[PDB]
Design an enzyme around this catalytic site. Sequence first.
Site, PDB file in Angstrom:
ATOM      1  N   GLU A 193       0.893  -1.293   0.140  1.00  0.00           N
ATOM      2  CA  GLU A 193       0.229   0.148   0.003  1.00  0.00           C
ATOM      3  C   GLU A 193       0.869   1.379  -0.089  1.00  0.00           C
ATOM      4  OE1 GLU A 193      -2.913   0.140  -0.415  1.00  0.00           O
ATOM      5  OE2 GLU A 193      -3.652  -1.718   0.218  1.00  0.00           O
ATOM      6  N   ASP A 204      -6.318   6.382  -4.763  1.00  0.00           N
ATOM      7  CA  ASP A 204      -6.093   5.121  -4.877  1.00  0.00           C
ATOM      8  C   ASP A 204      -6.044   4.569  -6.493  1.00  0.00           C
ATOM      9  OD1 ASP A 204      -8.629   3.993  -5.468  1.00  0.00           O
ATOM     10  OD2 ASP A 204      -8.428   3.044  -3.410  1.00  0.00           O
TER      11      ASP A 204
END
Length: 162
Positions: A11, A20
């Site tokens: 991440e 994202d």
Amino acid sequence: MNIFEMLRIDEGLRLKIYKDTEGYYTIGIGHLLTKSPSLNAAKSELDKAIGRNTNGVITKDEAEKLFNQDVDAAVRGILRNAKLKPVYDSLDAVARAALINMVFQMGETGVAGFTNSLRMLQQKRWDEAAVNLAKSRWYNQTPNRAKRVITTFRTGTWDAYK
Ligand SMILES: [Cl-]
Ligand SMILES: [Cl-]
């Protein structure tokens, strides 16, 4: 290696609101704020999550706190899910981290729908499960990450992360 280090790799860490892979407002270590297209909406969720007027920026400690909360939530969600729990109970410690990673990325619902792969994982049909996991939007959208997770289930080792 452990689940935290694993997710930190997949991440990354960002201290300012970012979008994202799906274009959603996120912060820290993969902490999704909202699916809403509004930055104001994101800023509002952020402040409520942190407990202060952030102005879309947080410290490293704040990010890690959200991260701890999110990993905990993922495990707890798995344990309360009737479809997931039995799979998780059946796996070795490494493979369990792979399951948590997928739940952290796609949510409990998302995962619980890989019905066929779950059964293969529960049966310990490693190679077959790996092939089945790859036939998914998940793998086609984030292939490098998906390959790392798939390798993790397949071999029961952290080699994809070293
Ligand atoms: Cl939160
Ligand atoms: Cl990827």
